[PDB]
């Protein structure tokens with residue numbers, strides 16, 4: 001899965017997520033390309049947690065999205081929560097270590113303290129550190145300041161994400 | 167100029183997207199260029215063998231194009247990418263298609279420098295995928311090394327066929343025959359692929375209007391969670407990790423549950439303040 005965001009001179013925002021559904025799909029390969037695997041989640045489309053998104057207010061436009069399978073909205077929600085409540089730059093927030101939940105487990109990007117682990121233990125979530133950066137996604141975003149007319153962005157180092165504006 | 171920007175998970179996609187925009191192109195035209203480049207240079211993650219979705223929000227219009235794969239009569243879906251891009255071009259684009267495929271074609275034919283992430287992806291995938299068909303990705307039996315130039319001649323051929331014939335170059339003819347043989351999918355299912363145009367889900371959150379991806383995508387779930395986090399004021403606990411985490415776990419299982427019971431009807435109503443009010 002890959003997510004990109006584009007904003008043009010007309011202020012049109014595209015937010016797109018494309019995928020093969022596992023890295024190199026099924027791995028089957030023909031005519032120079034890899035074939036997707038289809039999750040069983042005729043011409044039916046399966047359910048996906050992909051969620052390309054745009055947010056707009058007077059004065060601000062945001063295009064945002066992420067890869068990360070069934071974790072996607074778990075990845076995006078704390079990011080947008082912190083951003084809209086003033087915690088810092090979208091890029092700093094994106095850089096912050098992440099966590100997601102799967103049934104009763106909390107997957108954590110860093111080693112948490114015994115202090116916080118035990119609070120979660122009697123909650124009672126158990127905690128497990130995931131060793132793949134790609135597991136916690138790859139958030140890509142652009143933000144247009146609509147007053148002043150400037151575009152900034154953020155990319156996720158977990159995927160070597162970057163951004164540019166004019 | 168005028169202001170414009172690209173954010174993507176590969177620097178060559180960023181570069182090619184910026185090039186389109188610098189020369190006066192639209193967000194849609196750049197997105198087609200970017201999508202095809204990513205299929206070439208970030209090939210582990212997306213491409214012509216897959217699908218996707220695209221949200222387009224202009225001053226005057228909101229559109230969601232669904233080009234996710236469809237199930238035929240391993241599990242491989244009929245690829246939607248090529249049909250998506252052509253549909254997007256014909257209905258929302260500006261420049262002719264041929265021009266937009268050319269940057270991707272150049273990276274296929276001339277090559278690009280592989281990075282550390284593609285090497286590692288190949289390394290980790292080798293047990294699942296490595297076959298006698300994959301020699302260009304595993305030179306001398308090992309994952310192609312960071313810094314090395316990867317040239318994709320077969321893919322250039324396919325992309326040039328699509329460049330010349332349109333979507334028929336993928337969904338019919340020799341390419342369609344290749345897909346049929348490899349995926350065990352009928353020529354009929356391949357040719358019958360259709361894109362869906364959908365209305366974006368629209369809600370509000372923190373004084374923002376929010377446009378997101380509708381069913382079968384999960385924009386409803388994301389917006390519910392955002393609205394739940396706003397209402398429950400979880401941000402007040404952001405400095406207190408166990409509380410923040412626990413409260414986020416609660417919000418996510420509520421929303422995931424709601425998606426589940428409704429996997430088996432208005433998405434705008436599902437992200438409304440009143441719907442969020444009743445969520446438990």
Ligand SMILES: N[C@@H](CCC(=O)O)C(=O)N[C@@H](CCC(=O)O)C(=O)O
Pocket residue numbers: 001002019020021022023039067068069070071134211
């Ligand atoms: N473990 C898989 C499946 C998760 C799911 O769909 O429930 C996974 O993480 N999939 C992702 C892999 C690709 C990526 O770049 O994240 C996905 O988004 O398809």
